[PDB]
Each structure stands twice: as structure tokens, then as C-alpha cells.
Specification:
part of a larger assembly, 5 chains, A mainly alpha (about 550), B mainly alpha (about 55), C mainly alpha (about 60), D mainly alpha (about 50), A: about 550 residues, 32 helices, D: about 50 residues, mainly alpha, 2 helices
Chain lengths: ~550, ~55, ~60, ~50, ~650
């Protein structure tokens, strides 16, 4: 009893305009800006409160999995419809999406023709007016500018219409990904002191989709923890489409601009999937993730070269840098260096989930993937490789004291007698502080400042893996200026003075900060040493005090620490 | 009807035409007062005509 | 030109209907129109005659 | 002689393709519709 | 910016300062900010985000400086007055050599915004660019309002603002957030184009671009349906229609009748006013009136073709609209309901005028007269001013704030006054100006904030009552001519007499202030004057002057006798009113004792005053003569002639009459 009425209203409303379908662009904008009115609007409220949208956002693959919905398509297109149906059929034949999704995208593009036309190059009269205003400032393109008549006559053509439809399809894919990501973010890390309507909507959406009830002493995370593989599997199709464009698509449309747009869309979709996975993982921080999923994920990354094949181009650097940072973040998250070391040193069973530590095959796969990544000569694998090297360095010693399953791994790839490869990898990673520099760059692209690529909460929860890595790595490599500047660039991110506000947020966002005063490893090694090295080493203590005073303004329990 | 309405239409705010009712009233009141004072003079003369007998 | 013509027509419609709209078949708008015609023609005569008068001054060399 | 032709053409074309000149008509039309509605209203009022 | 914000709080920590010092510092800061704004168009930044943040900051500073100067007209805004004045003189009438140096930054910002690609990542840069665009738009709006004020006939910035709107027409396509601010700016440009044909906007926008912008904006926030962006788009549409814009108005009303035009949705919203938010209903009705008064032939035609859905809803609203809504659940909704009723009455009156011009207003008027109950309840009666609480608040504020007065928070008419809690008192600034010391916040949401909000709501209600007064005045004036035949005379006469009595009672009861609202003297007298005029022309009065004349006599006694003062129109209209009243009485004993007061104390005193002043006068003397002539005709005087001989002989009027005759 889950229909697409609210999801895909009747075509008569879309055509007559009596009800504009809530495209994913508007939902993504409303979830990103956190607007109260829009989020509490009746239309969007009914759209999100529907179980159909919940099932769709919990299974995005089904939204574009190739299916045979000819009957539904014919029933919807029956009772300017001929052109709409023709475009929908052409898109469904070109791309593997279903006919319903193609029809919906075509309807959305039809309703959004005004924007697609206004985002086009301006006319000649406009360029003349701009030149008259100007009496630097040369962001025009008069060599290709044309009049409005020839711009409109070319807009109504068939090739241009199909190109605009494909561009709108890619934009709607990106908007759906961003919208579901922001929705998961707002539902998991909801900020306190929000309007009653927002809290009620959050509770309703949770109880309807994942049965996550705050009044229950133990909510049902099952349906929320099952969102990691749902996107880790879709990343496969994302990279497959990135490395190969649709074959059924006409060759005339496969131009340089179209290829670049497709690559950027695939990279954005992969980044959003990785972010959703990281969120679903950090939702359960202390417990381990199912090793059956990490095995396949590490095999995927081994095969794809950590998405370096699609990101190897020089025209996607702005999207590659954040993509590589998020890949490293999710790798360090699923690695759980902190919990892994706790288990290796404590030997007590967590009971939350079985880790990959009991499977030698997963260890072999991870080791060969790290080896291939380091041999390929890629920087994105620097922090992940370093971390893995540390883990192996702790497993070696664990074996020396016992001289059980991990022993199989340690003896399978000839890693028991010699420790040369991991040591050389760590040496190369620490040489010239390349690992620290790349970690600082990732934190900058995964921070809270305006330079960050994601929302403030996203970066706040992403810096946790790097902070834990520095925590467990601090007692191994000695205290030195490079790790300190790295941690400073991580925690502070390089924000300005006016980027400090007393806006109370969720405790989760403040976790990454309070951990400095919660865990003894990050308290007696960085904070105490930073205080002791003053005013001799002024920048670390100064930046630490600055970030602490900026983050603990509302925290009355730690307001007098600075 | 609509044809003639659009033919004899003037480009101007509508709230200004209705306002002319005030002017028209101010111009009618004068004649109305003149009729009052004439029917009054008449009445007076009548009552005098009934006083003499 | 066409649109301008449409405009002028509509203006005429509004003025004519506003001034009188309970007898569009009447002789007033008739006299108005014919009399306008005469005005225009008289103007033409005047102007052109003035032009010819000006043209004579050239021969007065 | 083509230059002279396209010069004239450019001049007249430039004279036509102006914001103000093109805008005046549009402004005029609404400016007329105002009087249209106003007159029609005032007419209906004095339609006795 | 922080220094200017701190100086804005001139109602207070500050040991070692003075007005002159702060004024000089603010002037220097303004000069430095203007120099930075003029020089930023030449620096080469490593990235665009730095220049964007700089432009945002300087624009926000200039906007906060401009708004603070015109938001109030008291001395509180004198510390930053030389600075605001400087910035305005430099951004409204700059020299022709450096005129483009101050405008190129805004053009470059708009260009960078209209050609920035859409990206799901980097939300910081996105929000910074959005705030920069909103600040630039607010600054443009502030400059336009400043130019509109102070009487600026030649605005050289309008030529550049037109070509900036040329880009702002496409800018929203990149981000929906810009849809409201952009429209606001456009509305302010149109307002400056009204009080100043203007430059054709279609020449700058373009046919295709203009049609695309219209098709994008015609749907008022359809996917969400918010109230703020709705009122914004309705005020924008009303302003665009009110001005000389004709191409855009036609394309927005017709839609290329109306099938996808703004009106097709405005009717859909009007047919659900019973449940729609009253706040948006006011803006919708304002748009309807703006489209009717300037483009009636289309709006009225479409409404008559679809009157079956609008007249029924109007009747429903009228019948179930109580008069005294304060006592019931709701205090701020009273002003909104009064404004909605006033707009509905105005629209009904306009359509009735159009129908009368078309000779089709009989049945509609006969059906509408049965819906005037809310008018009879809360129409001409403006006694809901409740001067008691206003005076109490004024005294309480003058006792706690000796330096700052309650009248100091009066708006300078810089921005269109909202019909909310900030109609007269500037609450948006007061919240940050008086919230520094204890007393503004108050326990349990008490103190001066709630009282100021209630006073603003009462003032908005009074304004809505005045609007309804004008609307009902026009409606009844046209109905008196419409309902000339001998039918429905009973209810008609009852309503007219009730209106006259309410007006005469309000003329005696507590009056509103003259500095806030318009003087009512001579504004509501001609209404009853013409009403009684037409009722006498119809000769359908119940000769019930025994009580109606008492209010007129009390008014004439308590008017201070301004026979020849500046209040000459008021005296003349009162004289005409009493003339028509005593004439109606003549058509009808207990009347003579009640009408001898005018013959003894009124006519003689006014005649003596006129004779003494004349040593203007002709018409007043003729009116007094006509009054006496029509008053000496009442039947009750043909027997009390004995009793009146002495009162008429006591003043010796014959001597002064013969003297003036000489």
C-alpha cells in the first residue's frame, strides 16, 4: 500500500501547474539551508512523511535499477503529452533507468525550463549594456554571443532539448543524493533548541522509516545501520558509469562537455554515497561494522584504485581532493584504529558485531589492496596505508608475546619473519611530512570553516577518524612539530576570528573538541605538552585556547577550562 | 458590450473617477439649497395668502 | 505598425464607448468622425499650401 | 558599397533594439489598460 | 561595522566619549569604507571568496549605516547622521568622472553570481555568496528608498540599476534564495520610477528573458507555500502594476483572460480566505486592488466571468465577521481582519461602479446590501483607539526614560509602513536599542515590549478602520444613487441613519492624534452631508431628528467656535449638516424646544462673529442666511413666535444687518 501519488503526482497537475512536483533540487536546498518554513511546509511535510519516499531513500538503487514498468508508464501517460512521452521513452532506452523515473525527470525538466533558459549565455544587447556600464571585469564571452532570436530558435531544437534533458537528469541525481544525505544528517545529528515543528517532523520521519524512537531506551538502529551497504553497493555502479558512458546513447551527444558533466556528476554521486556511509557508520562509533561488507568494500577499492582512475584527470581536482579526503575518512572509519587497538590489547569481545579481525581473508585483501595502492604512487592512500602499517606493527608484537586467526594472515603473505614492507611504507609516508600535509588538506576540505567542502556537522564528524589516528599514533612516533601543526590544522581548520558564535548545537558536533579533554591520550600528550611548551611554542597553545574558547561557549560544564 | 467598454475606456486610475462623485455632490448641493429656499419663500407667501384670506 | 494600429483602435474604442455607450449607432460620433476627417484634410491642405508658398520664395531670386 | 548598407542597417537596427524605445510601448499599453479599467468602472457607475 | 553597530545604541560603560567624538569617528569610518569600496575594483585576490567576503562586509556596513539614519527621525540617530548623509550624497549624486567607479563593484558581483556553477559541495562558499547577494540587494533597495526620499528628481544611479536588473532577472535561476530579495529590489526601483514614461524595462530585460522571468515568478512559492515570500511577491506585483509599466503588466495579467497568469492563482487563494492566513490575504487583496484600479477591464471581466466563486466567499466573510474581535480569542488578527474587510469593500465598490457604468449593478447591489453587517458594526466608528492604554504607556515610558520620549520612535516614512506590530513604533530597532537594561525583556513576556506591540496593533487597527471608512463611504455614496427606486427603503434608511449617528458620536468622543493619523475634521462630515442630501432628494426620512440633532448641537457647542479660523471647511460642513438636519425636521410639539437652541445661541453668535470680522465671508454669510431661513420654517415655530421674539431681539441683529447693508 505504498504508491507514488505524493512522489509522482498525476501528469495533469504537472502540466496544468496546479501542483509543482517537489523535485529533489528543492528538497536538497531546504535540507542544506535548514529553513524552518520550507521544512515545515505542508507539501514537503506530506512528501517526507510518506512511506513511499522513505522506502525510496532507503533503497536508492531501486530508484534507478533497470526494471520493466511499461504497464505503469502507459497507465500514467494515459488519462503536450506526446512529446513528453517520446522524451521519456528515449531517455529510458538510452539510460538503464526505469520509464517512471525517466517520465518524472522529463516532467521536472519541463517545469524547470525557465531556469535552464535563464542560465544560458546572455544576448548581444545584454553584452552591450554591460559594456556601457563598465564605461578586470572581463567575465564575458562576446566572441560567441548571439542575439536572442537565434538563441531561442536553437533552444527549441531537438538536440539541444535532449542535451538539456540529460543535464537536468544529472542535476536531479546530484540533488537526490545531496537531499538524502542532508536528511540523514538532520535526522541523526539534529541540533537542540529547534522549533517544535522540526522536532515533531523528525520524530515522525524516524518512527515511520527506521522506528528510531527517542522515548525508547534502546532505539532500533538496524534499519539505520543497514544504510551503509545500500550505498557501498551503489558506488559500484557509480564508478562503472564514470569509467564508461552509456552505450545506447547517441554519439552526437557524447561531446567533451557532456563527458565532463557526466564525470562530475558521477564524482558527486560517489562523494555523497561515501558521506552517507560515513554518517551511518559514525552513528554507531564504538561497535564494529560487519566484516562481510568491509571485505567487499576493500576489494572494490583495490580494483578501482581508490577511484584514482576516474579522479586521475586534472579537470576534476576541485572534486577529486574532497573525494579523496572522504574516501580516506570512510576508510579510517571502517578501520576503527582506536577500537581495533583496544580489542588487540584487551582481547575482550565487544559483542556489538564481529570484526574483520577474525577473518584472515579480509586481512589478506586489505594488505594486498594497501600494497597495490602504495605501489601505484597515489597520495590518497597515505593516511589509510599509514594506519594499516600501524595495525600490522601492533599485530607483529601481539604475535611476539604469544610466540589466533590473525596468525594465518601474518603467515600467508610472508609477513611473520620480516617486517620490511609495512616499515618502508610508514617511512615513505612520514618522509617530508607528506602524510601530515595530506591529512591537514583533507581536514581543511572536511572541516567547519567556509573553506570546507561539506556542512559544519559533516566535517565535525569526519575529523573524528583523523583525531583518533593521531591519538593512537601519538604514543608511537614521538612528539614533533609536524604532528602538532597537523592536529592544529585539523581542529582549527584555519577559520577566521568572526567564525565564532554562541549557537548551541548537538553534543555530537562538540565531541571532536571535548575529546581533547576526555581521553587521557589526547590530554596528557597534546594539551599538557602544548601548555608546557609556552610561550616557547606559542602557536599550538594559542590555537588550542582559541578553538576551545570558540567551541565551549555554551557548554557550561567546560566553560571555565580556557 | 465589452467592445464598446474597451473603446470608450480611458487610461487612468479607477479610484479617481468614483471620487468625482464628491465634486458632483458639492455642485448639486448648491442647486438643492436654492430649491429649498425657493420652496420656502413659496410656502411663506402661501401662508400669508392664507392669513389675509 | 500592426500592434500600434491595434492600440490606436482600442484607444478609439475606449474613448468612444466612454463618451457614449447607450447608442453606438448615433449621429454624434458620426459628426465627430466626419468632422475629424475634415480637420485632417484641412490640415493637409494648409500644410501643403504652405509648402508651395515656401517653394515660390525660391523663384523670387 | 556593402559597408554603407550595413552601416545604415546597423544604425536603424541599433535605434530599434533599444531598451527604452521598446519599453515605452509596453509601458504605454498598461498605461492604457489603467485608463481602460478606470473608464469602464466610471462608465458602469454612470451607466444610468 | 561593529563600531557603527555599537554607536547605533545611543540610548545608554561610556565614560570618556561625546556626541561630537562619535560623529567624527563615524564620518571617518564612512570615508574609509567608501574608499575601500571604490578601490576594491582594482585589487587582484588569489581567489574570489576573499573579494566576495570583502564586498559583503562593506555592503552590510553601508546598509546598516543607511537604514539607521532614516529608520527614525529623532535625535537618537544624530551620531551617525553626518556619516549616513555623506554616504548618501556619494551614492546618489556622485561626480560624473567617478560615477562608474562606485557602480562597477556591484556589476562585477552580479556577474560573478550569475555565472557561478551549481555545486552540491562547499556549502560555506555558497552561503557566503548568498549573503553577499542579499546584502547587495538590500543596499540597492536602501539607496533607492533614500533617493525617493528628500526629493531627488534626477537619480543617475537609476540608469545603472536598470542594467543591473537586466542581470538580476536571470540571477534567481542559479539560486531560489535570491527570488525574494531580487523582487524586493525591483519593487523599490519601480517605486523610484513612479515618483520621478520611465525607462522601458522591456528594453533592458528582453522579450524572451522577460517572458522567462514572468513564467518563473508567476507561481507564488508553489512547492512550499510560505507566507513571507508570498507577501513579498504580492507587493512586488502590486508595485509593478501601479507604475507605468504596461508591457510587463499585460504579460503578467493576461499570461502571454488569464489561464496561467498570476490572477489564475490569486483567485484560487481568494476562494479559500476562510482558512488562509490573514497575513497573506491582505497582500493578495492589495494585489487585486492594484490590478483593478489600473487594469480594470481585465480583472473585473475575469471576476464577473467567475463571480460564482468570489461573491459567495465575500458574503461568507462578511456575514461571519464580528465587529468587536478584541474581546474574543485574538488580538493581532483584528487589524488584519479589518484590513481584509476594507479591501473587500473597496473591490465591491469598484466593481459596482463599473457595473453601474455598464448598467448592471441593480441585482448585485441588492444582494450585497444584505452583507453590510460587519460595516454597521465596525465601520465609521473609529472609537477603538483606546487612548487610555496609549497614554498610560507614554507616561510609564516618560517616567522611566526622562531623556528618550515615546514619540522619538516614529518612523520617517522611509519604508512602506507595515500593518503589523511596527506600524508606527520601530520595534525592529527598539529590540536592540532598549534591550540593554532591565525592563524591556520583562518577566513572563511583560514590560514595555508587549505594551508597545499592543499599541502598534491598535494603530494598525485604526488605519484599517480608516481604510474601511473610505471604502464604505464610496460604496454607500454610489449605492444611494443606485438604490433610487422605492424598494428596500426600510433597511436602507436604517443603515444610513445608523451611519450618521455613529459618525456624529465619534465626532464627540475621544479623537485620535493629529501627528500619527490624518485629522478627521472635515473628513467624515461630508459623508453624512451627502447621505442626508440624497435621502432628502428621495424624501424617505423618518423625521426622527428629536435625537439626531442633539449630537450636532453638542458638536457645534464643543468645537471652540472656529467660525473664521483655519478650520473653515469643518465649520462649513457642520453648518451644511445642521441645515439638512433641520430641513428634514421641518418635514415632520417636542421639536421646538430642541431646535430653538440653534436659533438662539448658534445663528446669532455666528452672525455677530461674521459681522465683526468682515468689518470667505460671502459664502459663510449666505450659508448662515440659508440656515436661518430653513430653520424658521419648522411647524413648532409658528406658535412659539412669542417665546422667540425676545431671544431674536436680545442680540439686536437688525442693527448690524442694516449697518452691513449700508
Amino acid at each position: 500500500t505504498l504508491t507514488d501519488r505524493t512522489y509522482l503526482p498525476p501528469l495533469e497537475d504537472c502540466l496544468t501547474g496546479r501542483t509543482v512536483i517537489l523535485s529533489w533540487r528543492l528538497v536538497a536546498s531546504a535540507l542544506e539551508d535548514a529553513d524552518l518554513a520550507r521544512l515545515t511546509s505542508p507539501a514537503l511535510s506530506t512528501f517526507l512523511r510518506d512511506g513511499f519516499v522513505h522506502e525510496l531513500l532507503k533503497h536508492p538503487a531501486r530508484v534507478f535499477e533497470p526494471k520493466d514498468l511499461k504497464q505503469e508508464f502507459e497507465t500514467k501517460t494515459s488519462s503536450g503529452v506526446d512529446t513528453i512521452k517520446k522524451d521519456a521513452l528515449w531517455l529510458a532506452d538510452a539510460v538503464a533507468i526505469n520509464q517512471v523515473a525517466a517520465l518524472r525527470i522529463v516532467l521536472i525538466e519541463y517545469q524547470t525550463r525557465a531556469h535552464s533558459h535563464l542560465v544560458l549565455p546572455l544576448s548581444t544587447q545584454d553584452v552591450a549594456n554591460i559594456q556601457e556600464a563598465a564605461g578586470i571585469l572581463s567575465l564575458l564571452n562576446p566572441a560567441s554571443a548571439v542575439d536572442a532570436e537565434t538563441m531561442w530558435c536553437d533552444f527549441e531544437t531537438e538536440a539541444r532539448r535532449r542535451e538539456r534533458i540529460l543535464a537536468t537528469y544529472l542535476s536531479e541525481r546530484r540533488s537526490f543524493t545531496a537531499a538524502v544525505d542532508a536528511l540523514v544528517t538532520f535526522l541523526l545529528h539534529s541540533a537542540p533548541g529547534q522549533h517544535k515543528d522540526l522536532d515533531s517532523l523528525r520524530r515522525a520521519l524516524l518512527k515511520d522509516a527506521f522506528a528510531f524512537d527517542e522515548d525508547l531506551d534502546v532505539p532500533d538502529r538496524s534499519k539505520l545501520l543497514t544504510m551503509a551497504p545500500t550505498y557501498m553497493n551503489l558506488v559500484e555502479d557509480c564508478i562503472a558509469r564514470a569509467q564508461a558512458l552509456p552505450a545506447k546513447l547517441g554519439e552526437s551527444f557524447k561531446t567533451e562537455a557532456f563527458e565532463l558533466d557526466w564525470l562530475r556528476t558521477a564524482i558527486t554521486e560517489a562523494v555523497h554515497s561515501l558521506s552517507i556511509a560515513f554518517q551511518a557508520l559514525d552513528l554507531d562509533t564504538p561497535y564494529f561494522a560487519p566484516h562481510e561488507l568491509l571485505s567487499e568494500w576493500f576489494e572494490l577499492m583495490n580494483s578501482s584504485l581508490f577511484l584514482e582512475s576516474i579522479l586521475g584527470f586534472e579537470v576534476v581536482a576541485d572534486l577529486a581532493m574532497p573525494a579523496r579526503s572522504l574516501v580516506s575518512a570512510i576508510c579510517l572509519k571502517m578501520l576503527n584504529i582506536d577500537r581495533t587497538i583496544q580489542f588487540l590489547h584487551d582481547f575482550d569481545y565487544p559483542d556489538g558485531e564481529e570484526p574483520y579481525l577474525l577473518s584472515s581473508q579480509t586481512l589478506n585483501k586489505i594488505h594486498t589492496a594497501v600494497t597495490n595502492a602504495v605501489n601505484s604512487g597515489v597520495a590518497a592512500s597515505l593516511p589509510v596505508a599509514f594506519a594499516w602499517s600501524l595495525i600490522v606493527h601492533q599485530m607483529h608484537l601481539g604475535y611476539q608475546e604469544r610466540a589466533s586467526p590473525y596468525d594465518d594472515f601474518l603467515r600467508e603473505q610472508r609477513l611473520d619473519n620480516d617486517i620490511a614492507p609495512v616499515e618502508q611504507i610508514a617511512m615513505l609516508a612520514t618522509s617530508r611530512g607528506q602524510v601530515y600535509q595530506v591529512m591537514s588538506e583533507m581536514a581543511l576540505c572536511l572541516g567547519t570553516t567556509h573553506e570546507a567542502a561539506f556542512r559544519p556537522a559533516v566535517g565535525a564528524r569526519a575529523r573524528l577518524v583523523f583525531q583518533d589516528l593521531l591519538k593512537r599514533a601519538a604514543y608511537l612516533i614521538p612528539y614533533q612539530d609536524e604532528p602538532v601543526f597537523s592536529l592544529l590544522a585539523i581542529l582549527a581548520t584555519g577559520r577566521q576570528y568572526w567564525d565564532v558564535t554562541d549557537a548551541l548545537s548537538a553534543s555530537s558536533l562538540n565531541q571532536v573538541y571535548t575529546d581533547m579533554l576526555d581521553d587521557e591520550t589526547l590530554f596528557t600528550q597534546f594539551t599538557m605538552q602544548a601548555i608546557n611548551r609556552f610561550p616557547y611554542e606559542f602557536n599550538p597553545f594559542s590555537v588550542l585556547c582559541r578553538v576551545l574558547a570558540a567551541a565551549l561557549i555554551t557548554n557550561k560544564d567546560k566553560a571555565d577550562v580556557v | 458590450d465589452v467592445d464598446t467598454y474597451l473603446s470608450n475606456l480611458q487610461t487612468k486610475t479607477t479610484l479617481s473617477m468614483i471620487a468625482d462623485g464628491l465634486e458632483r455632490s458639492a455642485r448639486d448641493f448648491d442647486a438643492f439649497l436654492e430649491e429649498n429656499v425657493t420652496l420656502e419663500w413659496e410656502a411663506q407667501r402661501k401662508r400669508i395668502y392664507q392669513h389675509f384670506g | 505598425g500592426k500592434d500600434l494600429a491595434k492600440m490606436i483602435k482600442e484607444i478609439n474604442d475606449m474613448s468612444n464607448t466612454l463618451s457614449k455607450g447607450s447608442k453606438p449607432d448615433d449621429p454624434l460620433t458620426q459628426i465627430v468622425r466626419v468632422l475629424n476627417g475634415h480637420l485632417a484634410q484641412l490640415q493637409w491642405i494648409d500644410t501643403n499650401a504652405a509648402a508651395l508658398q515656401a517653394k515660390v520664395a525660391a523663384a523670387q531670386k | 558599397d556593402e559597408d554603407e548598407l550595413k552601416q545604415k542597417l546597423q544604425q536603424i537596427d541599433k535605434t530599434l533594439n533599444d531598451p527604452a524605445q521598446g519599453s515605452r510601448l509596453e509601458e504605454l499599453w498598461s498605461r492604457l489598460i489603467v485608463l481602460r479599467g478606470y473608464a469602464e468602472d466610471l462608465k458602469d457607475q454612470i451607466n444610468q | 561595522a561593529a563600531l557603527i553597530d555599537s554607536a547605533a545604541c545611543s540610548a545608554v560603560p561610556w565614560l570618556g566619549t561625546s556626541e561630537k567624538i562619535l560623529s567624527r569617528v563615524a564620518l571617518a569610518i564612512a570615508q574609509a569604507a567608501l574608499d575601500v569600496y571604490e578601490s576594491t575594483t582594482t585589487w587582484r585576490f588569489r581567489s574570489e571568496l576573499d573579494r566576495s567576503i570583502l564586498v559583503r562586509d562593506v555592503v552590510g556596513l553601508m546598509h546598516k549605516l543607511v537604514v539607521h539614519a532614516h529608520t527614525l527621525s529623532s535625535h537618537l540617530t544624530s551620531t551617525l547622521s553626518p556619516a549616513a548623509a555623506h554616504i548618501i550624497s556619494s551614492f546618489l549624486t556622485p561626480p560624473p568622472s567617478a560615477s562608474s567607479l562606485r557602480f562597477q563593484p556591484l556589476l562585477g558581483t552580479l556577474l560573478v553570481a550569475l555565472i557561478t556553477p551549481r555545486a552540491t559541495l562547499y556549502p560555506g562558499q555558497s552561503r557566503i555568496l548568498a549573503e553577499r547577494v542579499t546584502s547587495v540587494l538590500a543596499f540597492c533597495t536602501s539607496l533607492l528608498r533614500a533617493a525617493d526620499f528628500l526629493g531627488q528628481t534626477h537619480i543617475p544611479l537609476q540608469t545603472h540599476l536598470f542594467q543591473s536588473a537586466c542581470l538580476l532577472a536571470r540571477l534567481p535561476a542559479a539560486n531560489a534564495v535570491y527570488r525574494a530579495p531580487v523582487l524586493e529590489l525591483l519593487r523599490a526601483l519601480v517605486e523610484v520610477a513612479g515618483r520621478a514614461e520611465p525607462p522601458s524595462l522591456l528594453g533592458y530585460l528582453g522579450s524572451h528573458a522577460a517572458r522567462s522571468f514572468i513564467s518563473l515568478v508567476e507561481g507564488i512559492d508553489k512547492p512550499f507555500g510560505r507566507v513571507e515570500h508570498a507577501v513579498v511577491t504580492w507587493r512586488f506585483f502590486a508595485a509593478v502594476i501601479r507604475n507605468r509599466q504596461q508591457w510587463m503588466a499585460g504579460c503578467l495579467l493576461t499570461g502571454r483572460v488569464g489561464e496561467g497568469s498570476v490572477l489564475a492563482a490569486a483567485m484560487e487563494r481568494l476562494r479559500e480566505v476562510k482558512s488562509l492566513d490573514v497575513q497573506e490575504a491582505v497582500a493578495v487583496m492589495d494585489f487585486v486592488v492594484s490590478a483593478q484600479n489600473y487594469w480594470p477591464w481585465t480583472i473585473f471581466a475575469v471576476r464577473k466571468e467567475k463571480e460564482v466563486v468570489d461573491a459567495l466567499r465575500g458574503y461568507v466573510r462578511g456575514l461571519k465577521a464580528p465587529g468587536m474581535v478584541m474581546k474574543t480569542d485574538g488580538a493581532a488578527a483584528a487589524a488584519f481582519q479589518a484590513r481584509i474587510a476594507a479591501y473587500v469593500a473597496e473591490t465591491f465598490a469598484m466593481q459596482l461602479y463599473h457595473m453601474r457604468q455598464m448598467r448592471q449593478a441593480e441585482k448585485f447591489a441588492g444582494e450585497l446590501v444584505a452583507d453590510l453587517d460587519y460595516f454597521l458594526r465596525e465601520g465609521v466608528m473609529v472609537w477603538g483607539y483606546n487612548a487610555s492604554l496609549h497614554g498610560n504607556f507614554a507616561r510609564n515610558f516618560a517616567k522611566r526614560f526622562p531623556g528618550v520620549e515615546v514619540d522619538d520612535f516614529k518612523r520617517t516614512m522611509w519604508l512602506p509602513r507595515e500593518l503589523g506590530k511596527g506600524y508606527y513604533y520601530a520595534l525592529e530597532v527598539a529590540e536592540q536599542m532598549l534591550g540593554f537594561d532591565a525592563g524591556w525583556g520583562g518577566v513572563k513576556q511583560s514590560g514595555f515590549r508587549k505594551e508597545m506591540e499592543t499599541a502598534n496593533l491598535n494603530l494598525s487597527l485604526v488605519e484599517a478602520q480608516v481604510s474601511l471608512f473610505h471604502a464604505w463611504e464610496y460604496l454607500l455614496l454610489e449605492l444611494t444613487l443606485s438604490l433610487l427606486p422605492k424598494k428596500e427603503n426600510a433597511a436602507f434608511a436604517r443603515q444610513v441613519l445608523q451611519v450618521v449617528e455613529q459618525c456624529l458620536e465619534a465626532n464627540q468622543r475621544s479623537q485620535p492624534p493629529e501627528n500619527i493619523f490624518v485629522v478627521l475634521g472635515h473628513a467624515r462630515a461630508g459623508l453624512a452631508l451627502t447621505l442626508l442630501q440624497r435621502l432628502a432628494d428621495a424624501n424617505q426620512l423618518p423625521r426622527d431628528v428629536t435625537h439626531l440633532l442633539a449630537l450636532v448641537s453638542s458638536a457645534i457647542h464643543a468645537v471652540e467656535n472656529p467660525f473664521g479660523a483655519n478650520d473653515l471647511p469643518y465649520f462649513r460642513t457642520l453648518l451644511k449638516i445642521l441645515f439638512v438636519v433641520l430641513r428634514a425636521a421641518k418635514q415632520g410639539v417636542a421639536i421646538t424646544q430642541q431646535v430653538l437652541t440653534i436659533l438662539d445661541r448658534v445663528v446669532a453668535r455666528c452672525f455677530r462673529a461674521l459681522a465683526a470680522l468682515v468689518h470667505t465671508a460671502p459664502e459663510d454669510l449666505a450659508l448662515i442666511t440659508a440656515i436661518l431661513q430653513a430653520c424658521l420654517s419648522v411647524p413648532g415655530i409658528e406658535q412659539c413666535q412669542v417665546q422667540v421674539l425676545n431671544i431674536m431681539a436680545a442680540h439686536d441683529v437688525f442693527q448690524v444687518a442694516v449697518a452691513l447693508f449700508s
